[PDB]
From a paper:
However, the FANCA–FANCG–FAAP20 (AG20) subcomplex is essential for monoubiquitination of FANCD2 in vivo. FANCA and FANCG are critical for the localization of the FANC core complex. To understand the basis of the FA-associated FANCA mutations, we determined the cryo-electron microscopy (EM) structures of Xenopus laevis FANCA alone at 3.35 Å and 3.46 Å resolution and two distinct FANCA–FANCG complexes at 4.59 and 4.84 Å resolution, respectively.
One of the major classes corresponds to the dimer of the CTD of FANCA. The two structures of FANCA alone show that the FANCA CTD folds into an arc-shaped solenoid structure, which forms a pseudo-symmetric dimer. The FANCA CTD structure consists of a chimera of 14 HEAT repeats and three helical motifs (HMs) with two to four helices. The dimeric interface between the two FANCA CTD molecules includes an extended network of interactions involving more than 40 H-bonds, 10 ion-pairs and extensive hydrophobic and van der Waals contacts. Two Cys pairs (C999-C999 and C1006-C1006) are in close proximity, consistent with the results of the intermolecular crosslinking analysis using hydrogen peroxide and bis-maleimidoethane. The FANCA CTD structure reveals a long path decorated with a cluster of positively charged residues, providing a rationale for how FANCA might interact with DNA.
Residue numbers in the entry:
A (entry chain B): 632 to 669, 693 to 972, 989 to 1342, 1356 to 1402
B (entry chain A): 631 to 669, 693 to 1342, 1355 to 1402
Write the structure that this text describes.
């Protein structure tokens, strides 16, 4: 079956020497007549390399008699025959894939030219392949896959190839007006030889000289008797007809496609040393940075440069990576020229804007598919800030003869779209809450005092952006030596008065836990109850040894006992989302509640209310530090822990019923069972014994329906 | 049967060790007989090694459980002796140890590691174990670094689990005596990598120094055999008050340079830390070594010694990484993964931004440049081999560094009395000795080191009061001290203007100064008059206008005939443009020669056209060819001090191509001609020690000498034909003429 196939398919070469006078047809009829009978199986893995190779053979057979200009009426015919079938033309594609992926690094130097000429001739026939494993579209959705995988793994081959699917097309498909010629070759080959050449082959970047002695002449078809691959792709980049062709729009290269090619080329694959791979870029960036905007580029707007780089980085996420690090180093190389200038007119606002607009597209709530992309882009938004620090980009000083050091930005980004980033809820992670401190330490040099500015910053930080101090406290032990060393490195004097009170509080806590000394209180009941909580929770000590050491008689006591209830009902959850069912610390809260009762009341509902109607100050200094992933999930905890109490939760409380309903409304808007929604009866019971506004028996019968509002809104007016 | 008896013996040695049976050791001598009955990547046997090493690695863990090491016996010493007494097996086990540590580092157990660590310590105790027939290593000590400086780069989580069991075994074997001589049991190097790998991997022991003085007994009675992990066995040992008072001596002292030399070599891949976590470690360490004393090796609290010491290492780690490149004709050779380099250079700019941004600058920068004046003196001309020349691999790092910095460091910023004037005197004195780098052009620098400068003076005037009266002062002090920078702008204007303009418009929207503007005018008086022809303006300084014109021509691909017709004919500043236009063409010829050596005729025609265009005025063009400073008018120095020295060593190679292509009589009415001709021939010989051009020179510097200046009438051509003794007679002939 195949022996005769190899014979026939090999009986072609003798024909094509001089007698190529339309007789290469009946042999094609025979090829097709005998081909009728025949995971990369062996039937296909072998026939492919048999059809293809006949090309690499016949081409070289005929390229000795005459060049391709005059001959070349067989190839179109052979390829039209091949494409005439379906179960074979779909094997050559995958075979060439495997043959340029695995063996590509070393196959041959003349089994290549026998692949370009099969690419091109696969273009002038525009065949149909709508059905295939992956490629659903026409070829144009196949060249890009191949070329991209290849230039990501192997570079030298990509150029060895691109510069051979061109030279075969200025010889062939010549002698025709320059208006329709450009439709023969595909665009991407040129759109990529506009990129590779000046990367590998220097001397052609625009530095040295333009040598030209043979510019207007059909270049020699010498690839079969050549001298190297550095004069077949340079005797082409210097031909006028091409160098004047890389100006159309059908194939441009702009400063958002350069990245997505260079930002995915992993070292250990390239062919350039480090201190050349880091000159290519510094040349490129500074060539798409002095280029018009109608073309891909930005005139001189460093701002626009950084903007584009960030917008590209965000569009690649779709850990350890090497290429991305170079881009994130060029960011610094660019920015460090800004902070040392103190624009005061174009300031950090130009940057953060990007995030806000990349973070609105994912507002179309759906089936657990966009939230993921949201946090995935957010983690990258964070990784960046850690990748373009001179470490005080996040600081907005001023100038009126002095420098004030304020930071009016990064306080909104945090309060809005960063606090909902990491675990533990109320806190941030310990990789971004150190940049702010190691930044105020490093920007406190410009001023004249260097010990007062820091105090002003950290005194302002109490009102706005409190979620940073808590993230420090929760992560202080691995943060003290850092600063204690930085300061001594720069100045070498005592510390200020607002970076050591935290140390004093930690030390007091520690020295008081071992024995017990009725801990004091620094008039700040949402700080001094974070230390006290985190130390315990890390050293595994229980409750009894947590609040047994408070000395509250008339000072700030209830607040230090409510902050703990908050921090204790925001970690019942981190132990639910994290592969769990229920955690045993609610006893701590049932004890804190009894301790608040022993005092003069000091109600606890400020937490379980989302609006800002009458929530006292700390009650809205707390929720301004949480994450909207939890606050949308409190009712769960509310109805978990409530049933452990009765006969005092209402009759001596204020605004209970209202809050219970405000919650039970949201307990439904989550989904769209018996072990989760059982407080039906609970809410039904609290009514019969509550602060009777009207509540005679109406709301005891209305819970038998889905209208907690059909009559409640009016049933409150009678209060 | 060298095997059966072997396994029988190394098995009977198994149970006999659970108890320290007195005198039950001669059974070792039996293995001596067996081995004596049996005697690159060797694989001939390559099993005796494992057969003999597993004996230890198994008998140890088999006995341990009955008694701790100290009360174990005198077994391992005798074993190691019966091994080393045959210096062929001792030449193998080493090889298998290293081969299985490196290649299959992760594919190992948690019980064989200690079996190698204890064996290593026992080796160290038997120092008389010294072999010479092991290529690559002379003594024993070398082996330790040989394997560990590969382990600590290919895989870090095995240089810790192997350098902890050693200590946990030594502190259980020799922890009965040796109040002072304890130091000397373990090998030193082990006890250094710990001090570098423990904190890095785990943070709970970074900065804490003193917490208490509670006395301890010993680690948990050799718990490694049934440990619960390593984060607590490496931590129950860092606190042992007997150790922390041990890594203070000199032979266990890590330092700063010795740290950079190890962090650079970490492969980014195969590491264990995410890229956003191995930069906190560095941002901490760099600060932990700046607050120290110099006796330890760390800085004393300053910052200069913290940058000098990071540059002096990059200029010392690349030397062993020449790492050339080639793509066509690929020789299969993997590339070294992304080294920790770069990162270090990012923690070096977070530190320069803290001594230029301050309130007490006193902006001196003599340092950081005298550090480069040394590596270029280690091998000034040649390191006995032309592989890493000055302008090859050291002047490409004095740039990779000098770029990653801000564009302000290159400028001084004095603050004498708060006035804060501007200037530069340590980048000029230095760029006048790094222009020799760019051999491509010769009359220019590269571009990426010409933007920063012009982009710096603009980011420094800010600090001053009038941000547009210093620039006019700098760029006027220039034109007389550092020409080579402008001519690299002229050659690059159309890629540079939309940066300066945008910057000066983004800081504060005020009109430009009178020195970043003159250039736009001198460029627009060109890009137009080349179109359709009008005239040229001929601003004050010639050698800048000429650069503009010549480079613009080259960039637009025009011929070399417009350049000569759009020009004044009655101006006093005409010739001084043509001279420069000749100089640039010469240099272009010379560049074309150092690229597939040839001549590129057309330029030889351009130059003769120029010489004829300036010959009907009575001037003197033969003083470019004076490689001295004797009498060259001031226009010569301001050009030669911009030209590389790779080229002026070739100027003769271009003086005998376009001299004979002139008339034989219009190159003699000049002043002191032959004094350059023969003074250049003298240099045309030193090059040989092209070759076909020796004839044209031997004749052209031989026929002129008859109808030449009134210096000699005879015996000078005869003398020149005598031999290469032009000097022996010229030294006396020049006396008169």
């Amino acid at each position: 079956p195949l022996g005769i196939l190899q014979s026939a398919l090999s009986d072609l070469r003798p024909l094509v020497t001089d007698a190529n006078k339309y007789e290469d047809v009946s042999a094609q009829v025979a090829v097709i007549s005998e081909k009728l009978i025949a995971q990369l199986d062996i039937q296909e893995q072998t026939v492919a390399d048999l059809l293809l190779t006949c090309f690499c053979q016949c081409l070289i057979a005929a390229s000795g008699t005459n060049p391709p200009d005059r001959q070349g009426q067989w190839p179109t015919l052979y390829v039209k025959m091949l494409c005439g079938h379906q179960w074979a033309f779909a094997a050559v594609l995958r075979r060439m894939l495997q043959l340029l992926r695995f063996q590509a690094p070393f196959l041959k130097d003349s089994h290549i030219v026998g692949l370009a000429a099969f690419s091109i001739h696969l273009h002038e026939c525009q065949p149909s392949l709508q059905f295939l494993i992956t490629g659903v579209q026409n070829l144009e959705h196949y060249w890009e896959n191949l070329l991209n995988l290849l230039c990501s793994d192997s570079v030298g081959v990509c150029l060895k190839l691109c510069t051979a699917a061109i030279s075969y097309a200025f010889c062939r498909f010549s002698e025709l007006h320059q208006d329709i010629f450009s439709g023969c070759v595909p665009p991407l080959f040129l759109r990529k030889l506009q990129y590779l050449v000046p990367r590998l082959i220097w001397e052609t970047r625009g530095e040295v000289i333009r040598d030209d002695e043979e510019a207007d002449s059909p270049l020699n078809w010498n690839l079969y008797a050549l001298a190297g691959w550095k004069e077949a792709a340079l005797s082409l980049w210097n031909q006028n007809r091409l160098q004047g062709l890389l100006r159309e729009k059908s194939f441009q290269v702009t400063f958002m496609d350069w990245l997505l090619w260079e930002m995915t080329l992993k070292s250990n694959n390239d062919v350039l040393c480090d201190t050349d791979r880091q000159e290519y870029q510094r040349w490129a960036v500074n060539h798409y940075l002095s280029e018009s905007s109608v073309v891909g580029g930005c005139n001189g707007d460093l701002e626009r440069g950084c903007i584009t780089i960030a917008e590209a980085v965000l569009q690649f996420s779709n850990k350890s990576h090497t290429g991305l690090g170079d881009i994130l180093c060029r960011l610094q190389e660019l920015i460090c020229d800004i902070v040392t200038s103190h624009h005061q007119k174009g300031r950090r606002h130009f940057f953060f804007a990007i995030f806000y607009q990349r973070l609105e597209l994912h507002k179309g709530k759906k089936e657990l598919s966009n939230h993921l992309s949201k946090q995935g882009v957010l983690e990258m938004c964070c990784r960046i800030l850690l990748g373009l620090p001179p470490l005080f980009l996040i600081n907005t000083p001023s100038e009126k003869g002095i420098r004030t050091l304020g930071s009016e930005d990064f306080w909104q980004f945090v309060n809005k779209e960063l606090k909902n980033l990491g675990p533990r809820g109320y806190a941030l992670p310990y990789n971004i809450t150190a940049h702010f401190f190691r930044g105020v330490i490093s920007a406190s040099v410009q001023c004249k005092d260097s010990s007062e500015a820091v105090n002003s910053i950290l005194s302002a930080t109490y009102s706005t952006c409190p979620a940073l101090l808590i993230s420090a406290a929760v992560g202080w032990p691995q943060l003290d030596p850092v600063l204690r060393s930085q300061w001594c490195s720069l100045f070498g004097v005592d510390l200020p008065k607002e970076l050591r009170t935290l140390r004093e509080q930690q030390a007091s806590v520690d020295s008081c836990l071992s024995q017990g000394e009725k801990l004091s209180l620094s008039c700040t009941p949402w700080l001094s109850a974070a230390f006290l909580y985190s130390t315990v929770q890390r050293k595994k000590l229980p409750c009894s040894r947590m609040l047994e050491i408070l000395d509250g008689l008339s000072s700030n006591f209830s607040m230090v006992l409510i902050s703990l209830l908050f921090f204790s009902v925001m970690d019942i959850i981190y132990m639910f989302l994290k592969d769990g069912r229920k955690h045993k610390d609610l006893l701590e809260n049932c004890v804190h509640i009894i301790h608040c009762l022993e005092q003069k009341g000091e109600t606890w509902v400020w937490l379980f209310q989302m609006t800002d109607e009458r929530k006292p100050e700390l009650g809205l200094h707390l929720h301004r530090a949480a994450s909207d992933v939890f606050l949308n999930l409190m009712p769960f905890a509310f109805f978990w822990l409530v049933p452990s109490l009765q006969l005092e939760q209402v009759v001596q409380q204020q605004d209970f019923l209202v809050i219970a309903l405000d919650m039970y409304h949201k307990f439904l808007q989550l989904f769209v069972h018996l072990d989760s929604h059982d407080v039906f009866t609970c809410g039904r019971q609290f009514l019969l014994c509550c602060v009777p506004k009207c509540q005679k028996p109406n709301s005891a019968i209305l819970k038998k329906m889905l209208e907690s509002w059909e009559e409640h809104d009016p049933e409150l007016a009678a209060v």
